[PDB]
């Protein structure tokens, strides 16, 4: 008798698709063809942060736009002073397979996680002068792919167990669990208002969650392969996903559907990291073709290229003030661009 | 807070990083792969938590063995983390012929994985003492699962082991033939498979890994120095 509700779900998905199509009056290209092109964007490597041993899987900027934490698969977090390339802290990790790192918006804590299935929280502002593990968030049955601080006591982690979990750092338990994805949730992006976040999973779907009620608001299924990167548009009304389809896609939360596709026939390799500029006009996208690609977020044009890395570009972060873009890679170097 | 005292701190951190690069370079990282029926865990003890790490030393050389556990069935994403690893220790249950076919498919995906194209595989055909009994008795044979076993005969390499039934040799070298066939027909010369015969208790396994990792690094050096 489950076939009846299976057909119900099929007709429901058809209803969603038809509603999305009926709301599709004009593409983003048709509306922004009449605006000035961004033009040739040329960033150059202002800083090169050296010191990581193995490949770099993740970076996160501090909210001060000067400090950045970097995660290396040698089992080390390094806090960098990007202005002076000074290593502020070198945090040795219990597990050598960290796949994500986060900076608390207050700057007091840094989170990391990876194949150990644990979101380790490190307190940078100890009175003893050493960075020590404030908490270890166990409870995920898969590898941790992303973590993002909401406050100094809340953090949402995405895991390879097809589940996103909201955590309480003081308690150490999952306040909420998001269980909609059918594949490894690879990326995670917090909305600027922090009330929502989006997830990208290997099931090619992107889901929008409410961090409070634990409800998946919307589901987006534009891609064809695993979504490796996700980032919110600066106003929180849209997000961009980068997949193994060698394609970046822009989705609108209110339109509930895809806006643009950022693909080039010359590129056939998956996107590892994705980010926006401060105004959201530039869509930076890391690739395993060893180089990042600057995109025109409104016209889907390749505005520029960041080609300073000698291995797969794994992480990518634009400062909160929008001054620079840092780009870590599997060659163990971060690069600050401007 | 002087900047000159922060650069001194950053230089002291670099000094800690450089002496941690010495240990990282001198250590050898290994990835254990294999199914539940394969004696992967028994090898570990004879030499939620999502990764298990075993550190063993052979001839003053540090080996870091990374048994992966408490993950999902799909591994196309976290296997990228193990690129630029010294070797992959693949362990196979050679006795269970029904699950043996899935071991070749598991081995096939590892060998042709885009991120493990430069990583050699140290194959450990485990529980070969159980494999001898399963073919000496003759109750269950390989032809029931592999039709090409009847047309297979022992090659010039004829089991220089002290004493074993020729059917044991024919069967156990047929399992190698299936596994070596994948590593040769479906791969380049960038990485080499290293088949081995392993029992439930075999203290020689750490030496086999050391010898085979010595050859894997040897061919890295033969390519680093362009002597090839």
């Amino acid at each position, epitope marked *: 008798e489950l076939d009846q509700l299976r057909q119900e779900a099929e007709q429901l998905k058809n209803q969603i698709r038809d509603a999305r199509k009926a709301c599709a009056d004009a593409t983003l290209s048709q509306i922004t063809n009449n605006i000035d092109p961004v033009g040739r964007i040329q960033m150059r490597t202002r800083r090169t942060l050296r010191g990581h041993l193995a490949k770099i899987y993740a970076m996160h900027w501090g909210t001060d736009s*000067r*400090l950045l934490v970097s995660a290396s698969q040698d089992g080390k977090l390094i806090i960098w*002073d990007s202005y*002076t390339t*000074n290593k*502020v*802290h070198a945090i040795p990790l219990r597990s050598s397979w960290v796949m994500t790192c986060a900076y608390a918006p207050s*700057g007091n804590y840094v989170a990391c996680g990876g194949l150990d299935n644990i979101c380790s929280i490190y307190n940078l*502002k100890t*009175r*003893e*002068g*050493n960075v020590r593990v404030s908490r270890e968030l166990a409870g995920h049955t898969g590898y941790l792919s992303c973590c993002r601080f909401l406050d100094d006591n809340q953090i949402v982690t995405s895991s390879g167990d097809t589940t996103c979990a909201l955590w309480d750092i003081e308690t150490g338990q999952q306040t909420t669990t998001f269980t909609g994805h059918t594949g490894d949730v690879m990326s995670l992006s917090l909305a600027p208002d922090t009330r929502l976040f989006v997830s990208g999973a290997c099931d090619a779907s992107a889901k929008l969650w409410d961090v409070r009620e634990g409800m998946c608001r919307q589901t987006f299924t534009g891609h064809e392969s695993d979504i490796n990167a996700i980032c919110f548009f600066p106003n929180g009304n849209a997000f961009a996903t980068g997949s193994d389809d060698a394609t970046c896609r822009l989705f609108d939360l209110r339109a509930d559907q895809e806006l643009m596709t950022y693909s080039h026939d010359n590129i056939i390799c998956g996107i590892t990291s994705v980010s926006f500029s401060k105004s959201g006009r530039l869509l930076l996208a890391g690739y395993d073709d060893f180089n990042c690609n600057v995109w025109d977020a409104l016209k889907a044009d390749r505005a520029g290229v960041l080609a300073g890395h000698d291995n797969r570009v794994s992480c990518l972060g634009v400062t909160d003030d929008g001054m620079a873009v840092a780009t870590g890679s599997w060659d163990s170097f971060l690069k600050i661009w401007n | *807070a*002087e*900047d*000159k*005292a*922060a650069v*001194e*701190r*950053s230089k*002291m951190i670099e000094k800690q990083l450089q002496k941690d690069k010495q240990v990282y370079r001198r250590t050898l990282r290994l990835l254990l792969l294999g199914a539940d029926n394969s004696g992967k865990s028994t090898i570990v003890k004879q030499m939620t938590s999502g990764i298990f790490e075993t550190k063993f030393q052979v001839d003053k050389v540090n080996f870091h063995m990374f048994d992966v556990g408490a993950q999902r069935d799909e591994r196309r994403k976290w296997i990228q983390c193990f690129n630029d690893v010294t070797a992959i220790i693949f362990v196979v249950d050679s006795s269970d012929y029904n699950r043996l076919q899935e071991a070749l498919n598991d081995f096939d995906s590892i060998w042709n994985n885009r991120w493990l194209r430069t990583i050699s595989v140290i194959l450990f055909l485990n529980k070969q003492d159980l494999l001898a009994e399963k073919v000496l008795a003759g109750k269950s044979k390989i032809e029931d699962y592999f039709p090409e076993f009847a047309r297979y005969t022992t090659p010039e390499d004829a089991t220089p082991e002290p004493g074993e039934d020729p059917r044991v040799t024919r069967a156990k070298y047929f399992i190698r033939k299936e596994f070596v066939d994948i590593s040769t027909a479906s791969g380049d010369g960038r990485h080499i498979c290293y088949p081995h015969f392993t029992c439930a208790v075999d203290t020689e396994n750490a030496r086999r890994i050391f010898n085979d990792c010595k050859d894997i690094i040897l061919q890295m050096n033969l390519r680093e120095y362009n002597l090839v």
Partner: single-chain antibody, 231 residues
Framework: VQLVESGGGLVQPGGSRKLSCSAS????????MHWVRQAPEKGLEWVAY????????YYADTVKGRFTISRDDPKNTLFLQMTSLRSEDTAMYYC??????????????WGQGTTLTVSSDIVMTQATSSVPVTPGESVSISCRSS???????????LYWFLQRPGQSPQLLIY???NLASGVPDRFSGSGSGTAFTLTISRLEAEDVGVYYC?????????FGAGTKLEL
């Protein structure tokens, strides 16, 4: 966090003594360590400095070549050797915990102080020397420097301290605008490059003490005379 200094007592001028500070409760190896003496009924005076890892070592001009600030990280003990003591060296020798990175707060913890009794530089001037006042009403303390403490970085290397009677100085404001840890938000530092003002919003019974200022722009570090606050 705890710094305890040993050594002192009556010393003849034609002799010598060695001061030691045992550190406990923090990663002593990762902290630069300062010696700051305080002559009886006088202001603080910076004596010596040793960086983390026993690298950069500095001395005061009045003491260079005579004292030796040694450090033994494994025992978490800081030393200070004195070769030929003088009557001017009579002071309570504080030992200060200081760490330097972006956003750091050096001079944040001071030792309880050991007493030794013997039988150019950026001059910091605190024009006011005593501000008698009642609790409740805001109090402002001002100081001036010989040259601008506003570095090209964008931060003003000015540090405010408070030595309550019968106690050790404690950090209130670091880099002229940053409240220290455990300090109430009543205190507030201001200034542009040469004139600095510390504004206590609602002075309480614990604010009675001497409020020193110190520059960290260049060595030697120089303290002001300190403005006492009567009650």
């Amino acid at each position: 966090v705890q710094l305890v200094e040993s050594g002192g007592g009556l010393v003849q001028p034609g002799g010598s003594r060695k001061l030691s500070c045992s550190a406990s409760g923090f990663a002593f190896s990762s902290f630069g360590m300062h010696w700051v003496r305080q002559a009886p009924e006088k202001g603080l005076e910076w004596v010596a400095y040793i960086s983390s890892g026993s690298g950069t070592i500095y001395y005061a001009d009045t003491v260079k070549g005579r004292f030796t600030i040694s450090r033994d990280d494994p025992k978490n003990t800081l030393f200070l050797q004195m070769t030929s003591l003088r009557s001017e060296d009579t002071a309570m020798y504080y030992c200060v915990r200081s760490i330097y990175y972006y956003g750091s707060s050096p001079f944040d913890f001071w030792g309880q102080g050991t007493t030794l009794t013997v039988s150019s530089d950026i001059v910091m001037t605190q024009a006011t020397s005593s501000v008698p006042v009642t609790p409740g009403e805001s109090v402002s303390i001002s100081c001036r420097s010989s040259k601008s403490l506003l570095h090209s970085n964008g931060n003003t290397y000015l540090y405010w301290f408070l030595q309550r009677p019968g106690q050790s100085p404690q950090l209130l404001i670091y880099r002229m605008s940053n409240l220290a840890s455990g300090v109430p938000d009543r205190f507030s530092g201001s200034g542009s490059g040469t004139a600095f003002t510390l504004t206590i919003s609602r002075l309480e019974a614990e604010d009675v003490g001497v409020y020193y200022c110190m520059q960290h722009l260049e060595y030697p570090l120089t303290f002001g005379a300190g403005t006492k606050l009567e009650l």
